Enzyme design. Structure first.
Site, PDB file in Angstrom:
ATOM      1  N   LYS A 134     -20.976   4.234   0.506  1.00 48.01           N
ATOM      2  CA  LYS A 134     -19.923   5.078  -0.509  1.00 48.01           C
ATOM      3  C   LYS A 134     -19.992   5.940  -1.486  1.00 48.01           C
ATOM      4  O   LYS A 134     -20.400   6.103  -2.456  1.00 48.01           O
ATOM      5  CB  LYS A 134     -19.638   3.566  -2.061  1.00 48.01           C
ATOM      6  N   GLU A 151      -8.100  -6.579 -12.643  1.00 51.21           N
ATOM      7  CA  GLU A 151      -7.814  -7.425 -11.681  1.00 51.21           C
ATOM      8  C   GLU A 151      -9.597  -8.231 -11.430  1.00 51.21           C
ATOM      9  O   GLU A 151      -9.912  -8.551 -10.881  1.00 51.21           O
ATOM     10  CB  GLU A 151      -7.283  -7.068  -9.810  1.00 51.21           C
ATOM     11  N   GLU A 152      -9.990  -6.539 -10.882  1.00 47.54           N
ATOM     12  CA  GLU A 152     -11.564  -6.496 -10.302  1.00 47.54           C
ATOM     13  C   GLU A 152     -12.129  -6.737 -10.710  1.00 47.54           C
ATOM     14  O   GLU A 152     -13.680  -7.577 -10.484  1.00 47.54           O
ATOM     15  CB  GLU A 152     -11.671  -5.416  -9.710  1.00 47.54           C
ATOM     16  N   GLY A 196     -11.473  -0.871  -8.700  1.00 44.08           N
ATOM     17  CA  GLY A 196     -10.512   0.526  -8.336  1.00 44.08           C
ATOM     18  C   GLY A 196      -9.382  -0.672  -6.952  1.00 44.08           C
ATOM     19  O   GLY A 196      -9.458  -1.036  -6.572  1.00 44.08           O
ATOM     20  N   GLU A 235      -6.842  -2.239 -12.159  1.00 43.31           N
ATOM     21  CA  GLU A 235      -7.156  -2.530 -10.755  1.00 43.31           C
ATOM     22  C   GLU A 235      -8.317  -3.557 -11.300  1.00 43.31           C
ATOM     23  O   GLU A 235      -9.294  -4.052 -10.783  1.00 43.31           O
ATOM     24  CB  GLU A 235      -7.554  -1.451  -9.891  1.00 43.31           C
ATOM     25  N   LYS A 254      -3.592   5.887  -1.457  1.00 41.44           N
ATOM     26  CA  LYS A 254      -3.357   6.208  -2.719  1.00 41.44           C
ATOM     27  C   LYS A 254      -4.116   5.257  -2.994  1.00 41.44           C
ATOM     28  O   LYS A 254      -3.788   3.818  -3.121  1.00 41.44           O
ATOM     29  CB  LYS A 254      -1.671   6.368  -3.154  1.00 41.44           C
ATOM     30  N   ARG A 305       0.724  -0.992   0.536  1.00 40.06           N
ATOM     31  CA  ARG A 305      -0.270  -0.369   0.348  1.00 40.06           C
ATOM     32  C   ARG A 305       1.007   1.194   0.166  1.00 40.06           C
ATOM     33  O   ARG A 305       1.743   1.120   0.708  1.00 40.06           O
ATOM     34  CB  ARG A 305      -0.926  -0.066   1.100  1.00 40.06           C
ATOM     35  N   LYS A 325      -9.840   7.852   4.621  1.00 37.28           N
ATOM     36  CA  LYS A 325      -8.426   8.634   4.449  1.00 37.28           C
ATOM     37  C   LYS A 325      -7.845   7.852   3.023  1.00 37.28           C
ATOM     38  O   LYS A 325      -6.448   7.171   3.319  1.00 37.28           O
ATOM     39  CB  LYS A 325      -7.801   8.230   5.891  1.00 37.28           C
ATOM     40  N   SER A 373     -15.631  -7.157  -2.038  1.00 35.50           N
ATOM     41  CA  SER A 373     -14.919  -8.529  -1.526  1.00 35.50           C
ATOM     42  C   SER A 373     -15.605  -8.560   0.297  1.00 35.50           C
ATOM     43  O   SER A 373     -15.643 -10.057  -0.642  1.00 35.50           O
ATOM     44  CB  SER A 373     -13.645  -8.428  -1.559  1.00 35.50           C
TER      45      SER A 373
HETATM   46  O1  LIG Z   1     -12.573  -0.066   4.786  1.00 30.34           O
HETATM   47  P1  LIG Z   1     -13.220  -0.618   4.250  1.00 30.34           P
HETATM   48  O2  LIG Z   1     -15.111  -0.432   3.798  1.00 30.34           O
HETATM   49  O3  LIG Z   1     -13.137  -2.219   3.987  1.00 30.34           O
HETATM   50  O4  LIG Z   1     -12.861  -0.345   2.060  1.00 30.34           O
HETATM   51  C1  LIG Z   1     -12.345  -1.528   1.942  1.00 30.34           C
HETATM   52  C2  LIG Z   1     -12.833  -1.857   0.635  1.00 30.34           C
HETATM   53  O5  LIG Z   1     -13.519  -2.664   0.927  1.00 30.34           O
HETATM   54  P2  LIG Z   1     -15.555  -2.176   0.117  1.00 30.34           P
HETATM   55  O6  LIG Z   1     -15.083  -3.493  -1.252  1.00 30.34           O
HETATM   56  O7  LIG Z   1     -16.599  -1.886   0.473  1.00 30.34           O
HETATM   57  O8  LIG Z   1     -15.058  -0.770  -0.555  1.00 30.34           O
HETATM   58  C3  LIG Z   1     -12.270  -2.971   0.599  1.00 30.34           C
HETATM   59  O9  LIG Z   1     -12.328  -3.053  -1.500  1.00 30.34           O
HETATM   60  P3  LIG Z   1     -12.094  -4.228  -1.879  1.00 30.34           P
HETATM   61  O10 LIG Z   1     -11.425  -5.088  -1.774  1.00 30.34           O
HETATM   62  O11 LIG Z   1     -14.027  -4.545  -1.728  1.00 30.34           O
HETATM   63  O12 LIG Z   1     -12.037  -3.331  -3.988  1.00 30.34           O
HETATM   64  C4  LIG Z   1     -10.460  -2.496  -0.478  1.00 30.34           C
HETATM   65  O13 LIG Z   1      -9.921  -1.225  -0.204  1.00 30.34           O
HETATM   66  P4  LIG Z   1      -9.453  -0.604  -1.987  1.00 30.34           P
HETATM   67  O14 LIG Z   1     -10.455  -0.945  -3.461  1.00 30.34           O
HETATM   68  O15 LIG Z   1      -8.531   0.647  -1.935  1.00 30.34           O
HETATM   69  O16 LIG Z   1      -8.222  -2.164  -1.921  1.00 30.34           O
HETATM   70  P5  LIG Z   1      -7.714  -3.227  -3.604  1.00 30.34           P
HETATM   71  O17 LIG Z   1      -6.586  -2.550  -3.961  1.00 30.34           O
HETATM   72  O18 LIG Z   1      -9.128  -3.574  -4.269  1.00 30.34           O
HETATM   73  O19 LIG Z   1      -7.644  -4.332  -1.991  1.00 30.34           O
HETATM   74  C5  LIG Z   1      -9.921  -2.590   1.277  1.00 30.34           C
HETATM   75  O20 LIG Z   1      -8.641  -2.457   1.081  1.00 30.34           O
HETATM   76  P6  LIG Z   1      -6.902  -2.706   1.576  1.00 30.34           P
HETATM   77  O21 LIG Z   1      -7.243  -3.973   0.151  1.00 30.34           O
HETATM   78  O22 LIG Z   1      -5.619  -2.311   1.205  1.00 30.34           O
HETATM   79  O23 LIG Z   1      -7.129  -3.078   2.868  1.00 30.34           O
HETATM   80  C6  LIG Z   1     -10.979  -1.185   2.263  1.00 30.34           C
HETATM   81  O24 LIG Z   1     -10.628  -0.985   3.177  1.00 30.34           O
HETATM   82  P7  LIG Z   1      -9.350   0.234   4.120  1.00 30.34           P
HETATM   83  O25 LIG Z   1     -10.567   1.427   4.334  1.00 30.34           O
HETATM   84  O26 LIG Z   1      -8.660  -0.132   4.894  1.00 30.34           O
HETATM   85  O27 LIG Z   1      -8.841   1.440   2.774  1.00 30.34           O
HETATM   86  F   LIG Z   2      -6.058  -5.394  -5.401  1.00 28.04           F
HETATM   87 MG   LIG Z   3      -8.046  -4.401  -6.093  1.00 26.81          MG
HETATM   88 MG   LIG Z   4      -4.979  -3.852  -4.975  1.00 20.24          MG
HETATM   89 MG   LIG Z   5     -11.036  -2.458  -4.609  1.00 17.21          MG
END
Ligand SMILES: O=P(O)(O)O[C@@H]1[C@@H](OP(=O)(O)O)[C@H](OP(=O)(O)O)[C@H](OP(=O)(O)OP(=O)(O)O)[C@H](OP(=O)(O)O)[C@H]1OP(=O)(O)O
Ligand SMILES: [F-]
Ligand SMILES: [Mg+2]
Ligand SMILES: [Mg+2]
Ligand SMILES: [Mg+2]
Ligand SMILES: [Cl-]
EC number: 3.6.1.52
Length: 134
Positions: A125, A61-62, A42, A58, A11, A2, A82, A32
């Site tokens: 969201k 991948e997603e 994203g 992203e 970021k 990260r 944040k 997820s």
């Molecule tokens: O706080 P909650 O609401 O749990 O937000 C989650 C978010 O859940 P939602 O599905 O509800 O949006 C996840 O997204 P998904 O895996 O579903 O896509 C991840 O976000 P990102 O897309 O940025 O991350 P990634 O690069 O796709 O993995 C995760 O970050 P992380 O994987 O880095 O721990 C993020 O946690 P944080 O708050 O710690 O950032």
């Molecule tokens: F990811």
């Molecule tokens: Mg991802």
């Molecule tokens: Mg990722």
């Molecule tokens: Mg994501």
């Protein structure tokens, strides 16, 4: 790995993945952690990764789509979580059947009319709903 702005915000990069240049229908993916919820595909930028490259990676991948990267829409902060997200337009030209998150976690994807995308994003969201405001 990260990455963070100097103020400690995570970021991120994301795309509004449109079905066509008309930008009437957009692709959302299931959360997820909460598969009954929709989100904009994203995620985190990697070290020294250009935001436009992170956005395209992203959504590969997603969402399992590729296409023609369009304009930067804007940079959107989520003060509560944040995050600071670069949001791009992507016009989808390729829909792949067995993509990383479909294989790994059974992630879902669906086309939404813009109005309906905003509706399903609003509760959990609201910042992602605002991605569409322009
Ligand atoms: O706080 P909650 O609401 O749990 O937000 C989650 C978010 O859940 P939602 O599905 O509800 O949006 C996840 O997204 P998904 O895996 O579903 O896509 C991840 O976000 P990102 O897309 O940025 O991350 P990634 O690069 O796709 O993995 C995760 O970050 P992380 O994987 O880095 O721990 C993020 O946690 P944080 O708050 O710690 O950032
Ligand atoms: F990811
Ligand atoms: Mg991802
Ligand atoms: Mg990722
Ligand atoms: Mg994501
Ligand atoms: Cl469209």
């Amino acid at each position: 790995t990260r990455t963070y702005d100097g103020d400690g915000y995570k970021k991120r990069a994301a795309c509004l993945c449109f079905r066509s240049e008309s930008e009437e229908e957009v692709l959302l993916v299931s959360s997820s952690r909460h598969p009954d919820r929709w989100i904009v595909p994203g995620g985190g930028m990697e070290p020294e990764e250009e935001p436009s490259v992170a956005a395209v990676r992203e959504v590969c991948e997603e969402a399992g789509v590729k296409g023609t990267l369009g304009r930067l829409v804007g940079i959107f902060e989520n003060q509560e979580r944040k995050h600071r997200t670069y949001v791009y337009v992507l016009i989808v030209t390729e829909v792949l059947e067995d993509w990383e998150d479909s294989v790994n976690i059974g992630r879902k994807r669906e086309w939404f009319k813009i109005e309906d995308a905003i509706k399903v994003l609003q509760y959990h969201k609201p910042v992602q709903a605002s991605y569409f405001e322009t």
